[PDB]
């Protein structure tokens, strides 16, 4: 019962499918004489409510296992390829996941296509039990999917003038309403364009550029990756953040993430 919920929360398992996909073994053990369909649902619902309402990205991004060799880690490599001190960069990511940098609550992965921006952002978003994506096709409710999430991934679309203030709040980690409210949540933006551009009808303005970049850490990934590089895996995310935690260095609260030690 409640022993199972503790486990689901620890493992970040929100659905029976996931539970089976990730640990088919424990699912069969647990259910063995019987498959209480109600007990299962209750545990999952409870675990999910506990995770979405009170847990944070770090609980799932930071791997539980030691990372002896981080050099093989795709995230580490991508950062390295572009001139970033992976240890310093990891600290930015670590502090970012832990809402350590005040208004700088957003990591912006900028760069031309095939640089690994989506590879990283999506791996991270899929590592946490609950993540939301900013939906610009829905001009009315662009953040509907961003409630009670551990990571918000802004993958596409431009910010509209009608939501810029809300956007600044979310990107800046300040609670804001969208009926339903978005508590501070680490945002990761991936784009090949200046997403600080704001659309107001026929007008495109950069007047909100400074406010916007005051809430971001910007990484510039320009090194096109070989089609062979591979997808950053959930485990790689875990190892990367665990490694970051075990080797954290001081980070400067600056828009541009420096390129060096
Ligand atoms: N699902 C995936 N499976 C295998 N490799 C992937 C996957 N997604 C990304 N990659 C790798 O990452 C590189 C960059 O693609 P992403 O799609 O990461 O790039 P972008 O920077 O344009 O968002 C590709 O060259 C590819 O090798």
């Amino acid at each position: 019962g409640m022993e199972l919920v503790g486990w689901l929360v620890d493992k970040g398992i929100t659905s029976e499918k996931q539970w089976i996909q990730e640990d088919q073994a424990s699912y069969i053990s647990f259910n063995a004489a019987s498959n209480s369909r109600s007990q299962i649902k209750a545990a999952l619902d409870n675990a999910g409510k506990i995770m979405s309402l009170t847990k944070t990205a770090p609980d799932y991004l930071v791997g539980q296992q030691p990372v002896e060799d981080i050099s093989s880690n795709r995230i580490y490599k991508i950062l390295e390829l572009n001139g970033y001190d992976p240890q310093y960069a990891a600290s930015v990511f670590l502090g970012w996941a832990t809402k350590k940098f005040g208004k700088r609550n957003t990591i912006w992965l900028f760069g031309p296509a095939t640089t690994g921006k989506t590879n990283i952002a999506e791996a991270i978003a899929h590592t946490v039990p609950f993540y939301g994506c900013v939906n610009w096709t829905n001009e009315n409710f662009p953040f509907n999917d961003c409630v009670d999430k551990m990571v918000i991934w802004w993958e596409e679309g431009k910010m509209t003038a009608k939501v810029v203030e809300s956007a600044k709040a979310i990107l800046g980690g300040s609670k804001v309403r969208v009926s339903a409210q978005i508590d501070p949540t680490p945002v990761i933006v991936t784009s090949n364009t200046n997403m600080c551009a704001v659309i107001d009808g026929n007008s495109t303005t950069f007047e909100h550029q400074q406010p916007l970049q005051d809430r971001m850490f910007k990484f510039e990934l320009t090194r096109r990756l070989d089609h062979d590089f591979g997808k950053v895996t959930k485990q790689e995310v875990k190892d990367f953040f665990r490694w970051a935690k075990d080797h954290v260095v001081e980070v400067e609260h600056e828009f541009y993430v420096k390129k060096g030690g």
Side-chain angles (χ1 to χ4, degrees), residues 24-38 40:
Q24 194 194 102
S26 65
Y27 179 84
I28 302 183
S29 294
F30 187 81
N31 296 291
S34 116
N35 183 291
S36 147
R37 324 252 133 229
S38 69
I40 282 170

Side-chain angles (χ1 to χ4, degrees), residues 82-93:
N82 301 93
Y84 292 100
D85 184 332
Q87 173 176 27
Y88 183 75
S91 297
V92 172
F93 275 91

